[PDB]
Amino acid sequence: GLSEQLKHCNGILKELLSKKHAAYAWPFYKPVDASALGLHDYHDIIKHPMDLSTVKRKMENRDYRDAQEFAADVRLMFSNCYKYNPPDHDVVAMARKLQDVFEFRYAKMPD
Ligand SMILES: CNC(=O)c1cc(C(=O)NC2CC2)cn([C@H](C)c2ccccc2)c1=O
């Protein structure tokens, strides 16, 4: 009728986690460890943390009911990065590059 659109989403997720994009994807692999990185304001600024490992667990557990819900979580992850980090930080440049990969492939969703 995973749905056909959620299989496309799963394909995108596999690509975002692949060695192809690892040079700029790695900050998004796991939840931000705020205490480890000394980001003691992170959880005051970011109310809904998101990362690719959480998206993968949700996909594996069939949590997403459609492609829109999946895309909202991936975009939440990028938005958190843009909200917390200064716009000239290396992690924001990496977010922009990984979001470009995401948005162009998400746009190729089969109807
Ligand atoms: C989603 N990831 C983050 O928001 C994030 C923030 C900060 C961070 O220190 N943010 C401070 C507000 C500047 C550092 N990193 C890692 C450790 C990093 C360090 C150097 C280059 C690229 C990435 C993140 O992944």
Other beta carbons less than 10 A from residue 28's beta carbon: 26
Asked if residue 56 lies in contact with residue 50, where contact means CB atoms within 8 angstroms, the answer is no
Rounded Cα gap, residues 54 and 73, in angstroms: 9
Experimental method, per PDB record: X-ray
Total tally of structural domains belonging to the chain = 1
Q: Which two tokens stand for residue 80?
A: 């958190």
For 107, the domain range is 1-111
Nominal resolution in Å?
1.3
Q: Which two tokens stand for residue 35?
A: 């205490």
Distance from C-alpha of 83 to C-alpha of 43, rounded to nearest angstrom: 12
CB 51 within 8 A of CB 30: yes
How close is the Cα of 66 to the center of ligand 1, in Å? 30
- The set of residues, in sequence order, having a beta carbon less than 8 Å from that of 54 and lying 6+ positions away, is 31, 73
Tell which one of 91, 94, 97 to mutate to probe ligand 1, the residue whose CB is within 8 A of the most ligand atoms: 91
- Mark the breaks in the chain: residue after which each occurs, C to N over 2.5 Å: 1
Q: What CATH number does the domain containing 23 carry?
A: 1.20.920.10
67 in Cβ contact with 56 (< 8 Å): no
| Nearest-angstrom CA–CA distance, 6 and 49 | 22
